[PDB]
Amino acid sequence: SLTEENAKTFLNNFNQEAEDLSYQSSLASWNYNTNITEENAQKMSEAAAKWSAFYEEQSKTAQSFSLQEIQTPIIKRQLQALQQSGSSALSADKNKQLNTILNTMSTIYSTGKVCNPKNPQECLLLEPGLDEIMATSTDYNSRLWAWEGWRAEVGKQLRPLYEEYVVLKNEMARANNYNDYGDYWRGDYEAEGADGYNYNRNQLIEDVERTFAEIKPLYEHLHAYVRRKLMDTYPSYISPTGCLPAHLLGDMWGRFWTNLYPLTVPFAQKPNIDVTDAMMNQGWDAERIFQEAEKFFVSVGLPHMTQGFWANSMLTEPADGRKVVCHPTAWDLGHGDFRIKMCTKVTMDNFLTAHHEMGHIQYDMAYARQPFLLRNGANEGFHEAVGEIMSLSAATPKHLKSIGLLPSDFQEDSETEINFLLKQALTIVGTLPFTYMLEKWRWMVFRGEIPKEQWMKKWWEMKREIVGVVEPLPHDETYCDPASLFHVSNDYSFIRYYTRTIYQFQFQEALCQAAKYNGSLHKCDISNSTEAGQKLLKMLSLGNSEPWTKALENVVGARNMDVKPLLNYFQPLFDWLKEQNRNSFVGWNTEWSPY
Template identity: 45%
Template sequence: MADVKALLFLALVCCSALAVNIKSKGRLNSNEADAIAFLDQYNSEYGPILNQYVIASWNYETNLTDENAAAVGEAGAVAGAYYAEASATAATFDTTNFSEDTKRQLSYLDSVSLDDAESEELYNILSEMGSIYASYQACRSNPTTGVNECMYIEPELTELMAEVGNYDDHLWAWEAWHNGVGRQLRPLYLRYVELSNKQARLNGYADYGDQWRQKYETTEMETIVQDLYSQVEPLYKQLHAYIRRKLYNAYGADKINLRGPLPAHLLGDMWGRFWVNLNPIAIPYPEKPSTDPSPEMIRQNYTVERMFRTGNDFYTSMGLLPVPDTFWNLSMLEKPTDGREVACHATAWDFYDGKDFRIRMCARVVFEDFQTVHHELGHIQYFMQYAFQPLNYRDGANDGFHEAVGELMSMSFSTTKHLNTLGLLNVPDDPEVDMNFLLFQALNTISTLPFHLIQDTWRWSMFRGDIPDAELNDQYWAEKARVVGVAPPVGRDPASDLDITALFHVCNDYDMIRYFMRTFFQYQFNEVLCEAAGHVGPLYKCDFYNSTAAGDALAEMLRLGASKPWQDAMEAMTGQRDVLATPLLNYFEPLKVWLEAENAKNGEFIGWDLPATKEKAPVFLKDKLRGKLDVTSPKINKEAAKYLAPIFAEALQSLRKVRL
């Protein structure tokens, strides 16, 4: 998703002049009227420049040619130069006595760029990493036909990884992708870390991870995410044990250890991020009607366009805004068949002119993509609702809010009630069918929580310099094993592999804590909108379709954009300011009870034995204690006490393993 903040690294040139008459020299300008005039000019001039950059980016990502890449660089240089000069002008104001709104708008411009050469280098690195990811093909001789075949990540490798049963195909695809992409990206990524850290420090942050966390306008982000996960971890471990048994049944004892972590290549996608494609082997009551409408979509001759029009109807039924007419002929909804190389990862685009909004996606007629359609339309709805705001406010209250809106609507769309309404399901009101549905939802939600958490907590440690370069990949998989209970299917080379980079979000400079936070936000929003819609009964049966009351409540929050701290936006919608785990736990409580009983019946080991490691000391200890304990105080605070006991027990266990 393109946004204003993504252009910070594009401040390549500072030589072109911004026609601003109010720029002070020497003494800071304390006249708020001058600042407001500057912001008005910035909004009117930068919007069209930004629009041209996004158009160039769109042209490149829907046709990956060197010519289009050069055009992105040229448009980025113009946008970066303007932004850099505007930032310099914003810094000339003394905002002490300004209104909160003027202060907030100026704060988004308060940034310092790297010098021209390093800015250009960072831009080129990001461009090259994105291109490697999008254009890489894994090639082999087909084991059945003997014909040489090459596969992109979308859709060929994605479809291969979604199929359950062929262990060797999955192993080949996983290794080919991670070796082919991760090893190319490693040296580029290490330099990206250096430059991103340097730019973050120029702007007063401790490192780039600190800059990411500060987007949430709190210094307690690391504590918040760990506290949230500690509440849902018991549910995840029950799901993990249940899935491990199902994989054991599918692949056999020689492939699955019933006390060990899960092999990363058998979880339904290239990264083990979403487990939803395991539903065919995981469904609790397979004799009951399926809650996956994919076969019925095929039978009814659904097309990709029909999927998007159905999604658009879901939003408009709530009184929300329809996509503009231009959406239908300017978006890329399916993979082109004209031979172009394109970036396929589903993304929603705001062109910053208040009228052009598009989705780029290589959609297929399957339910998983139908859900993604509703998710991406959630981003579009957010764009349209805050399009009247000044440029610096045209963003979500935080990145997690933006993701939560789409996922929330996708979840409501996916209820058996709504799919029955669409004629895509015909399932009775049956507790066993409900359990099938809840398990399906958990494979799309609960499975992602430790994955998203580790993607960023590990990167936060890396940005801080806590992990030596030679140990990066080993430490990454050690953390994956410890928290997620997942292990690589083959040995990894610490000198050449950096497997975390072989994911779209990582090599394209996205934090992933947005997806972790969005999960909690989405269930918190869900409870409120269900109440507004007048829903009675279990939360997992709630459907917002045709509820204008729910639409009004959602739109009120969306229109705020980034004009207020996220806590204010949360309060406007939910009546309280904190992010909570209880709405998610309430939603999945029936599943948790069922999983506990099922796992106990089968004698499952809850948790997993960690693989042997050469690690000298638990690197996570410092991270977990960071900010928990005031070592200058003779008294341990309650929060520290809550963490110290399990951490020291964990550390002692690790040290014992080292001695052995």
């Protein structure tokens, strides 16, 4: 009769219909992504519209229950997760303007070519024919020209769209009891209701700033070492004491330094042993790859996969008559249906990707016992963290030696260990400061601390001091540098990549100290360990029903971010970096400019 029973009945009625209505949309989307044709695309619209209309109607009707008299945490959490109205708080005309601005920005990012001072009949777009110069080309006057053209052609018209997008997002956030759009994004980390595990919205910022504080010397040493290694190819261009150039890196934006591995290598003579050229001599298949993945996954204490999983999943490329978008996905269709859509090849890259998707498959079925509203993560970082630890553990050299991939003659050597540590570092250490800087820039832009006439004054200088990257050519108050990313072009949250890496290291350490392991943190695995692997299964049963603080405290023992497995991971790498960088100058100054 009172509020609790009515709210429970409304939640039950909503969950009775949503579980059936969302399944149709999920199944149609899976069919489209697997069988993209002219009929699935138009079939998307009616299912999506029906599901969206039902969800909006339920969200509107989920307001007559006040959030003060609900004492149970489950129903309060369900009502709050059903209270978020999203963009419906905006006016119809304002929502139409926001939609058309987003569409225009997306279609501008989709198009866009470059102009060459040489023969201009060549056009280079976002096709992989353009990033090859930035990743593989080792000469000058091409990568810099490509970067300048990309920032000049599509970097001009993205400014007027962004000016209106910022204010519209701020208005939409303010319409939902928020201070700014950055506050709305940070609200995902806000959890209310606990006994010592309560977390505040602003504290996230505080939990970020000191995190970057503990990766100053390792990143500075990596910057100095990569600069010194680049000196040989560019003795007259790279300044020994100055910051690294914006271009000439291993990425368009310097986010990923993976392509810098061939140029920056400790010992090029090392074979860098790989067993990709080993499955042909004895016979292997993609089905065998998935069988090995599931056998390893059930060797830790995880349930065996369903029979229909192997029947509804695509593991090899179709012969003819069907087209696949060629993107690895792990669909949760609903009603106990799970599928993997990806093309599997004979390569350890596909092996690692299959294990990463298998981690998601294990995670998704692990919360099948929730009333359709708690079937998510406590925070947005848990989803991609599950697949990272499984991929890391199966990639360990000891793991490959347990399945016959490695002959029982070569055990371990130090030089290959250092090479592997460096190549793994130049995928995370080189991207953490960039992510932090971009997130901070966006946060001050949305807060209002950066004026519209000084944008192209704060984006660069921080990159000169936080990331250690200096521009090759001046940029005035007419360009829009940060809008050129695909992530930025649409409403994507970028802080998720900053925290998730921590979750990649925090869990694994806790999964290795319970396996009677005393060695290096980068050489431990959870194979053949029933206990080391039970903790993750126990924790993978709450989702967002409990605060992420409690789930973390019961899995790793740390209530907040205590991120120091990275230093234990790359410990020989840091020691070697300190040893090598002795007759040099570690650091950079925000005064030098190449031109």
